[PDB]
C-alpha cells in the first residue's frame, strides 16, 4: 500500500493535487543552475597554477585560511555574467505561490533561489551563499552585500573590512567546515511535516546534505528530477526506484528544466509557469 497510485510523474502529479499532499520539501543542487549558465563548481573545468597541493584545496577551509587569494582569483574567473534563474527555480516559486512549499534546501551558493522569489524563511542554504559576506574578525562581523563583494573580486584586491581591515569572506561553507546550525534545526522540524520530497539537480554525493533523503517519513514519496539516477544504496557498502519492493520513489531522467516543465504541465500550471518565467527573464534582461 502506498500514497502514489503509480510510480510515475503522472502519479506524483495526481498525488500533489490530492488532499493528502500539503507540504513539499525541495532538495536542489548544481543541476538546477547549469542551464542558467552556471556550471557546477565541482566540475573539472574550473580546475585550470597557484602552487595548490591538490585540486580540492581551492575549496577546502584549511587552505583558504592564511591562503585566500587563489579562491578570490577563481571567484573572478567563474563569476557569472548574469544572474537569471531557471525554469526550475521559478517552479519552486510557483510551489510557494500555491501554498505547497514547506522548504527548499539548496546546495547552491549562486543566490538564484532568492532572485526567483524564495524568501529567507523558505530557504535553507546548506552550503551558505554569496548573497551576504562577513568580516572574519570575531569582534566585528560587519556584513556586506554581493554588490560590494563583486566589486572587490573584480578589482583583484582581497576584500578587506572597512571598519577593521580584516578579510571579508562570502557566507559560503567550505569543504571541511560545519554546516550552519540552521540546517540541522530546520531539518529536525521540517521532516516531521513533509508530504513530498522533490529532489532536483543533485547527485547526492556531498555530505551531510545527501543524507537528507533518509530523513523523510517512510510513506513520503520522493521524486528525483535529474540527468542521471542518484541516491540509490551503494552495493559496495536509499532510493528504490526499480525493484519489486519499490513503492514511493520516482526518477524522471533529463534536464531539470524539462522535468519541471513536464510536471507543471500535468498540474495544469504550464501557462502560469511560462508567463512567470518570461516576465522575470524579461525583467532581468532589462536591468
Amino acid at each position: 500500500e502506498r500514497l502514489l497510485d503509480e510510480l510515475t510523474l503522472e502519479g506524483v502529479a495526481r498525488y500533489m493535487q490530492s488532499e493528502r499532499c500539503r507540504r513539499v520539501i525541495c532538495l536542489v543542487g548544481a543541476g538546477i543552475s547549469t542551464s542558467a549558465g552556471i556550471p557546477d563548481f565541482r566540475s573539472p573545468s574550473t580546475g585550470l597554477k597557484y602552487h595548490l597541493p591538490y585540486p580540492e584545496a581551492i575549496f577546502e577551509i584549511s587552505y583558504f585560511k592564511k591562503h585566500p587569494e587563489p579562491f578570490f582569483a577563481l571567484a573572478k574567473e567563474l563569476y557569472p555574467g548574469q544572474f537569471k534563474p531557471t525554469i526550475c527555480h521559478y517552479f519552486m516559486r510557483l510551489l510557494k505561490d500555491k501554498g505547497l512549499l514547506l522548504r527548499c534546501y539548496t546546495q547552491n551558493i549562486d543566490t538564484l533561489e532568492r532572485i526567483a522569489g524564495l524568501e529567507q524563511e523558505d530557504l535553507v542554504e546548506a552550503h551558505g551563499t554569496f548573497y551576504t559576506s562577513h568580516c572574519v574578525s570575531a569582534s566585528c562581523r560587519h556584513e556586506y552585500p554581493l554588490s560590494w563583494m563583486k566589486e572587490k573580486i573584480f578589482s583583484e584586491v582581497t576584500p578587506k573590512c572597512e571598519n577593521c581591515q580584516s578579510l571579508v569572506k562570502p557566507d559560503i561553507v567550505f569543504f571541511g567546515e560545519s554546516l550552519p546550525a540552521r540546517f540541522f534545526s530546520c531539518m529536525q522540524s521540517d521532516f516531521l511535516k513533509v508530504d513530498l520530497l522533490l529532489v532536483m539537480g543533485t547527485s547526492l554525493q556531498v555530505q551531510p546534505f545527501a543524507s537528507l533523503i533518509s530523513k523523510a517519513p517512510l510513506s513520503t514519496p520522493r521524486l528525483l528530477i535529474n540527468k542521471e539516477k542518484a541516491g540509490q544504496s551503494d552495493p559496495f557498502l536509499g532510493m528504490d526506484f526499480d525493484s519489486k519492493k519499490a513503492y514511493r520513489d520516482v526518477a524522471w531522467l533529463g534536464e531539470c528544466d524539462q522535468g519541471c516543465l513536464a510536471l507543471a504541465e500535468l498540474l495544469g500550471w504550464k501557462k502560469e509557469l511560462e508567463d512567470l518565467v518570461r516576465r522575470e527573464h524579461a525583467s532581468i534582461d532589462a536591468q
Binding site: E56, H127, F175, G176, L179, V206, Q207, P208, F209
Partner: peptide, 5 residues
C-alpha cells in the same frame, strides 16, 4: 558533520 566529498 563537516561538509565532505
Amino acid at each position: 558533520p563537516r561538509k565532505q566529498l
